[PDB]
Design a protein around this ligand. Structure first.
Ligand SMILES: [Ca+2]
Ligand SMILES: [Ca+2]
Ligand SMILES: [Ca+2]
Ligand SMILES: [Ca+2]
Ligand SMILES: [Ca+2]
Ligand SMILES: [Ca+2]
Length: 161
């Protein structure tokens, strides 16, 4: 709308601890180990570099990844994006800007999806290569792996997943 187009609020490359709450607008802030809570409203969040804590709550938020090496892991440490409260079975995740290697059970460079109920999280990572080919890692609080669909997750791999 001409009043607001939900333009993300540009934070800092510092560790941003900022909140969005009920505003239908959300904060972006590349660097740092951010803690960004967005609860109500439709939200548009980019976590960037580092190991981040991104909460989205309510709404069909779009948490999106142009953050490639910014969401990578190694045995020497992981810099991933741990997304909290993100499962009304209709939340939006976008990894199309990463291209995404695929979801072929974690081999041939693709990633695997797993869900742990004790963690209440569905982690997505690859493990075939670590020092040899440091893999990507993300985590989402919810069990929306049972809701794996193109409408839930946008990707740009040459084979659908
Ligand atoms: Ca930041
Ligand atoms: Ca960050
Ligand atoms: Ca919000
Ligand atoms: Ca929200
Ligand atoms: Ca949400
Ligand atoms: Ca990150």
């Amino acid at each position: 709308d001409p009043s607001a187009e939900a333009q993300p609020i540009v934070g800092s490359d510092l560790d941003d601890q900022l909140h969005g709450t009920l505003l239908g607008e959300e904060i972006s802030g590349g660097g740092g180990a951010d803690q960004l809570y967005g609860y109500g409203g439709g939200d548009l969040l980019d976590g960037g570099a580092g190991r981040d804590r991104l909460t989205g709550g309510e709404g069909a938020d779009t948490f999106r990844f142009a953050l490639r090496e910014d969401s990578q892991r190694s045995a020497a440490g992981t810099f991933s994006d741990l997304i909290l409260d993100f499962d009304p079975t209709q939340d939006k995740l976008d990894v199309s800007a990463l291209g995404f290697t695929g979801l072929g059970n974690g081999y041939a460079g693709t990633l695997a999806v797993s869900v742990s109920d004790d963690g209440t999280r569905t982690y997505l990572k690859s493990y075939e290569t670590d020092a040899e080919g440091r893999s990507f890692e993300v985590s989402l609080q919810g069990n929306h792996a049972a809701a794996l669909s193109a409408d839930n997750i946008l990707f740009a791999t040459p084979v659908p997943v």
